[PDB]
Design an enzyme around this catalytic site. Structure first.
Site, PDB file in Angstrom:
ATOM      1  N   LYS A 116     -30.328  47.159 -38.083  1.00 31.30           N
ATOM      2  CA  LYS A 116     -30.164  45.876 -38.597  1.00 31.30           C
ATOM      3  C   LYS A 116     -30.623  44.691 -37.590  1.00 31.30           C
ATOM      4  CE  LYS A 116     -25.837  47.082 -40.972  1.00 31.30           C
ATOM      5  NZ  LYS A 116     -24.964  46.113 -40.861  1.00 31.30           N
TER       6      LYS A 116
ATOM      7  N   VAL B  18     -23.075  53.568 -33.676  1.00 35.93           N
ATOM      8  CA  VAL B  18     -23.835  52.198 -33.431  1.00 35.93           C
ATOM      9  C   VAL B  18     -25.258  52.042 -33.656  1.00 35.93           C
ATOM     10  CG1 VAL B  18     -22.265  51.949 -31.219  1.00 35.93           C
ATOM     11  CG2 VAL B  18     -24.399  52.939 -30.992  1.00 35.93           C
TER      12      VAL B  18
ATOM     13  N   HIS C  28     -24.533  59.825 -27.461  1.00 38.13           N
ATOM     14  CA  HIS C  28     -24.241  58.846 -26.434  1.00 38.13           C
ATOM     15  C   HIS C  28     -23.465  59.332 -25.096  1.00 38.13           C
ATOM     16  CE1 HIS C  28     -22.522  54.498 -26.773  1.00 38.13           C
ATOM     17  NE2 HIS C  28     -21.565  54.841 -25.910  1.00 38.13           N
TER      18      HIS C  28
ATOM     19  N   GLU D 239     -23.077  57.687 -31.089  1.00 37.28           N
ATOM     20  CA  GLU D 239     -24.139  57.237 -31.359  1.00 37.28           C
ATOM     21  C   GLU D 239     -24.753  56.745 -32.847  1.00 37.28           C
ATOM     22  OE1 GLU D 239     -25.357  56.656 -28.686  1.00 37.28           O
ATOM     23  OE2 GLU D 239     -27.736  56.416 -28.623  1.00 37.28           O
TER      24      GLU D 239
ATOM     25  N   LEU E  21     -18.804  50.971 -20.833  1.00 34.59           N
ATOM     26  CA  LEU E  21     -17.507  50.819 -20.992  1.00 34.59           C
ATOM     27  C   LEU E  21     -16.350  51.372 -20.068  1.00 34.59           C
ATOM     28  CD1 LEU E  21     -15.399  49.511 -23.521  1.00 34.59           C
ATOM     29  CD2 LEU E  21     -15.324  52.012 -24.266  1.00 34.59           C
TER      30      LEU E  21
ATOM     31  N   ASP F 282     -23.697  43.975 -33.167  1.00 36.90           N
ATOM     32  CA  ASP F 282     -23.363  43.065 -34.099  1.00 36.90           C
ATOM     33  C   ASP F 282     -21.499  43.001 -34.228  1.00 36.90           C
ATOM     34  OD1 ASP F 282     -22.455  45.379 -35.377  1.00 36.90           O
ATOM     35  OD2 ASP F 282     -23.311  44.604 -37.332  1.00 36.90           O
TER      36      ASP F 282
ATOM     37  N   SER G  86     -24.289  51.175 -23.741  1.00 35.04           N
ATOM     38  CA  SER G  86     -22.848  51.003 -24.272  1.00 35.04           C
ATOM     39  C   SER G  86     -22.276  49.630 -24.376  1.00 35.04           C
ATOM     40  CB  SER G  86     -21.766  51.902 -23.469  1.00 35.04           C
ATOM     41  OG  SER G  86     -20.407  51.933 -23.369  1.00 35.04           O
TER      42      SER G  86
END
EC number: 2.3.1.122
Length: 284
Positions: free
Chosen positions: A238, A232, A261, A229, A41, A153, A125
């Protein structure tokens, strides 16, 4: 060696963004497959975080694989934005999908003999979903996608909202400038979980990593790294369920009972994936 490797600092013109994009580069040899290492990021405009934080070029010298590290694009999600990427310091044009899928591979092929097809995209990230989306929509070019600690997602629930907060925090950008309000179809277009059928159909090789938020002796033991972490990780679990259910069969899922992270964990993954990349892309 760390000093002494044939690492270049390229100025690659981007017609669509109107400037030269800096690109840290190490050839694999002529006609070598490319490994695009996408930054996180808070991508800086001088050096890619992979270079900064790992001996990536060193690990990959003489592996048969070209290492390509685009520089810049904080909060871009390596996407083509609807509007100007305006942040704290000013505005810039973000057309990163266009650059990574046409401008750059063409320049690298013309000027460095890098094979323009059959590449891997690896991001961490923000860039982990980017990598899968690059592969989803450009499967000839990207046959492998690595995703390290990404929100997989981003179009669902609180994701558009969390993404906007991240972008605010990193450079002061606006998600609306990128993909529009959360109602816009660009959200689902750029959500790797929604693009599973494309990944599955294209039989994309996936390397999906996420820690659980528990640091070990490797470090990264700070609250933000841990919270991020853990946060996410559900999207990652999932994704794995959805992928399998859709008939996915070419992925590595790495969800250890550790990791935060932090670059200590990400560097470890990139080191660990080298032989898999070589086999999957045809190095040697």
């Amino acid at each position: 060696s760390r000093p002494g490797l044939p690492v270049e600092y390229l100025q690659v013109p981007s017609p669509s963004m109107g400037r030269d994009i800096k690109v840290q580069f190490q050839s694999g040899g002529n006609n070598s497959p490319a490994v695009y290492l996408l930054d996180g990021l808070r991508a800086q405009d001088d050096y890619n975080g992979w270079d900064i934080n790992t001996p990536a070029f060193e690990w990959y010298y003489q592996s048969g694989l070209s290492i390509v590290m685009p520089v810049g694009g904080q909060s871009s999600f390596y996407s083509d934005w609807y509007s100007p990427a305006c942040g704290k310091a000013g505005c810039q044009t973000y057309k990163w999908e266009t650059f990574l899928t046409s401008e750059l591979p063409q320049w690298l092929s013309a000027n460095r003999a890098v094979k323009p097809t059959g590449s891997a995209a690896i991001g961490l990230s923000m860039a982990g979903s980017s990598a899968m989306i690059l592969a989803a929509y450009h499967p000839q070019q990207f046959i492998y996608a690595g995703s390290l600690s990404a929100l997989l997602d981003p179009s669902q629930g609180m994701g558009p909202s969390l993404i906007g907060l991240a972008m605010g925090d990193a450079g002061g950008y606006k998600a609306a400038d990128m993909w529009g309000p959360s109602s816009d179809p660009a959200w689902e277009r750029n959500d790797p979980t929604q693009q599973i059928p494309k990944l599955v159909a294209n039989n994309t090789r996936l390397w999906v990593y996420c820690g659980n938020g528990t640091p070990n002796e490797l470090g990264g033991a700070n609250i933000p790294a841990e919270f991020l972490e853990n946060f996410v990780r559900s999207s990652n679990l999932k994704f794995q369920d959805a992928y399998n259910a859709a008939g996915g069969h070419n992925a590595v899922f790495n969800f250890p009972p550790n990791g935060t992270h932090s670059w200590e964990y990400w560097g470890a993954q990139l080191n660990a994936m080298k032989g898999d990349l070589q086999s999957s892309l045809g190095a040697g």
